[PDB]
Amino acid sequence: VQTDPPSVPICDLYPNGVFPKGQECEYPPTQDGRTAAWRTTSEEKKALDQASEEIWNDFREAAEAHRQVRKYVMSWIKPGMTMIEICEKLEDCSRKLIKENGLNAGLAFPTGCSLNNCAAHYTPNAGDTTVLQYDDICKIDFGTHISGRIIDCAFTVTFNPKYDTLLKAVKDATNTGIKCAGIDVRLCDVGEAIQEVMESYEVEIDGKTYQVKPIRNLNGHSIGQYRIHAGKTVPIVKGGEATRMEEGEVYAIETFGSTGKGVVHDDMECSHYMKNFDVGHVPIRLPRTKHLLNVINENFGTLAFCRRWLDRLGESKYLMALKNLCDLGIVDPYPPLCDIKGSYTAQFEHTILLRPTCKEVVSRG
Ligand SMILES: O=C(NCc1cc(F)cc(Cl)c1)[C@@]1(O)CCN(c2ccccc2)C1=O
Numbered sequence: 001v002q003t004d005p006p007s008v009p010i011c012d013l014y015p016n017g018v019f020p021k022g023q024e025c026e027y028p029p030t031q032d033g034r035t036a037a038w039r040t041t042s043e044e045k046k047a048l049d050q051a052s053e054e055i056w057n058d059f060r061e062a063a064e065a066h067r068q069v070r071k072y073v074m075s076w077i078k079p080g081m082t083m084i085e086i087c088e089k090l091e092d093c094s095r096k097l098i099k100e101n102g103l104n105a106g107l108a109f110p111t112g113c114s115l116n117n118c119a120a121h122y123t124p125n126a127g128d129t130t131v132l133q134y135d136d137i138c139k140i141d142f143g144t145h146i147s148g149r150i151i152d153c154a155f156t157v158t159f160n161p162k163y164d165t166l167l168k169a170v171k172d173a174t175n176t177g178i179k180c181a182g183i184d185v186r187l188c189d190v191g192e193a194i195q196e197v198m199e200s201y202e203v204e205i206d207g208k209t210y211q212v213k214p215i216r217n218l219n220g221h222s223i224g225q226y227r228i229h230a231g232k233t234v235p236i237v238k239g240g241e242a243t244r245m246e247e248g249e250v251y252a253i254e255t256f257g258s259t260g261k262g263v264v265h266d267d268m269e270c271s272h273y274m275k276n277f278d279v280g281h282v283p284i285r286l287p288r289t290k291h292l293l294n295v296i297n298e299n300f301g302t303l304a305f306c307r308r309w310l311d312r313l314g315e316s317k318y319l320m321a322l323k324n325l326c327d328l329g330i331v332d333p334y335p336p337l338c339d340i341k342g343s344y345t346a347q348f349e350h351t352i353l354l355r356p357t358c359k360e361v362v363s364r365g
Pocket residue numbers: 109110112120121141142152154217218219220221228229252254272273274304305334349
């Protein structure tokens with residue numbers, strides 16, 4: 001059984017190696033009204049589903065580690081803690097439960113703990129003295145993986161009840177996106193449905209009223225093996241592309257709500273980086289740059305990483321080698337994404353499997 005604090009790897013809690021399924025859903029009906037129930041008992045669909053059983057099982061193991069980590073985080077995350085303390089305590093638990101083992105199992109991307117106007121991609125670098133405040137709105141977004149089968153799942157933390165309606169708006173919008181998702185569903189329809197739900201909410205924060213706006217330049221996305229953003233985008237506003245979701249794809253369904261402009265821009269010091277998946281082999285002679293690329297290739301491959309993780313591996317004086325990798329287009333920087341100063345942003349996110357037989361919200365217990 002799991003300890004308190006959690007320290008037993010998920011693999012040791014399920015001795016037979018069969019990990020728990022997430023929530024299973026029938027796909028939404030078509031506009032004409034034809035149900036998709038036929039998938040659950042179809043001979044061809046069960047065969048295609050069974051063929052990918054090892055892949056779904058890997059996602060389920062990573063999802064169980066993610067659920068146990070986030071229940072642990074909710075039990076202790078409190079104002080007054082530094083953002084570094086929060087990230088290191090969360091990551092220490094995640095490394096243990098996922099039974100971190102090089103590229104076979106581990107952390108899929110850095111722990112995002114973006115605050116207030118910053119909506120995403122913020123994790124502290126060394127020396128960051130930022131402390132979580134009682135009035136902050138903190139987005140905890142972290143990932144686990146087994147064999148590069150990634151769980152991307154996020155939630156918002158608050159201490160002041162004044163943001164409760166903002167959180168409910170975004171949670172309802174994300175649950176709408178999850179409900180609307182399915183094989184052959186136009187991605188633009190998912191976005192329109194999400195916006196319609198999110199914008200039906202009005203919030204009052206310190207005597208100022210706001211209509212909740214989805215962050216138009218943030219979105220959900222397809223997930224590939226060791227590829228957090230596989231190429232398809234799930235909009236959270238109307239006006240997107242009518243491109244459809246397909247059988248066997250994995251999506252992160254996420255929404256962001258804001259009291260600001262509903263648009264993010266790169267801001268602050270960069271902490272997140274990730275190798276460009278489309279860049280092949282590049283011989284490097286420059287020694288510090290060569291060394292850092294070897295470190296990245298061995299420890300992260302195409303998964304996102306952060307500067308704190310390079311520090312933890314014992315690397316130092318690597319910032320110019322890292323900028324060289326960015327300038328060569330081998331690595332890409334992912335700086336914090338912020339709405340206007342004084343604005344509040346919230347996020348909820350789950351990972352879904354578009355299985356031939358059903359839609360499984362694998363990160364939801
Ligand atoms: O977990 C997440 N990010 C991790 C990540 C770290 C990294 F370094 C590189 C990548 Cl691509 C992803 C998010 O859910 C939060 C924001 N976000 C997103 C950003 C822009 C457009 C659409 C979505 C995601 O996917």
